[PDB]
Symmetry: C3
Subunit: 153 residues, 3 copies
């Protein structure tokens, strides 16, 4: 239900309170979580060999890199799903998000259920994209079952 997921999540949120709260919600549904208060922080953490399974990442990070610049810097050294966190959905922000990631965004106001559900869909989408025989196998099963079923008429 909210069992222990092996997935590691990196939160990139300058706001200490918003960072810690999101970490809390995820922690409580089973995710291993780390925080970075800046996009630069987050790049060092990923280039220092710690590879998350997902990045929740604010489009506003403050006076350094923003979320889009960090998403690209992260892209240079990794092929990790990035899901953006945003306060609002202005066209200028949505364009920026849809142009660096294929994995969408979550409102920082979202209910808890929404956040956790977007994170699972994102992790499952990414696994799907790293990959036929599924059809063949089923076909074998499908007639081997007919093989057997007819015997015990």
């Amino acid at each position: 239900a909210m069992s222990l997921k092996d997935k590691k999540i990196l939160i990139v949120e300058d706001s200490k309170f918003q960072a810690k709260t999101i970490a809390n919600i995820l922690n409580k549904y089973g995710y291993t979580v780390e925080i970075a208060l800046t996009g630069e922080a987050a790049v060092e953490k990923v280039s220092g060999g710690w590879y998350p399974d997902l990045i929740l990442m604010d489009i506003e990070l403050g006076e350094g890199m923003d979320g889009v610049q960090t998403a690209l810097a992260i892209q240079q050294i990794s092929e990790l799903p990035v899901v953006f966190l945003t306060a609002h959905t202005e066209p200028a922000v949505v364009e920026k998000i849809r142009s660096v990631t294929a994995y969408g965004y979550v409102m920082k106001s979202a209910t808890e259920q929404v956040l956790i559900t977007i994170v699972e869909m994102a992790l499952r989408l990414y696994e799907a994209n790293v990959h036929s025989d599924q059809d063949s196998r089923l076909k074998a099963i499908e007639r081997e079952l007919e093989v057997l079923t007819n015997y015990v008429m």
Copy 2:
């Protein structure tokens, strides 16, 4: 074949009787079972009474009572039913509220039949994916068991 009996129930939550029936008729044509609630309050009462649709199509604006966002919150405490919002337009203020109460998106009031049915179908399989995943019930883990029993079953011939 896309019109076949879907074997799925849809709850339209929509105060305009004319709009609700127009959507019910498209959903029936493609083989869905349909229920209409003219208010959010009627919708909450349907589910907390024990009736569970497979998906909700929720207008974000519902007249004098709860609006669609409120309604969606109220149902989120009773079940995790997938809720797809109906909306006239895509102003950031509206899209902001929709995306904070549902992970299943929205459909334009002006969408075509095919866009409606495909969004509904897609939302239904998304939810089935998440429920299956909440339960360890991944399609490949079923494959291991089904093949393993077919071995066992096979050996049973002397």
Copy 3:
């Protein structure tokens, strides 16, 4: 990887169409270009169905991308992903009204475009199989249900 999936690109600019076509070729998709919506409609009518259409919201002096998408919908269930420069509300509403498969920013990174193409391609295949019954989730429950009655009979 080398996919056996063919993508039709409907784009009035030859440079942009060829830019998109190069990227897709570099990842194993068979690609074909229509410079007008009138030509895309004739390919699908003349019986060349692609696996996905990448169509610019805005084309030439003929049909725009939305009208082209609506025509294709009269004769086919093909997945259509719009190319757009700007997600302004009026534009995003037109897009959301004629396709269930979303859009891509002209300025998207190459990884984003590619990923979106794979997702819309997978999604479309699921809907086709589900609507004709041939999806993997269903066929499992068909084997599981008959394998349950088979072994429940052996269990006696």
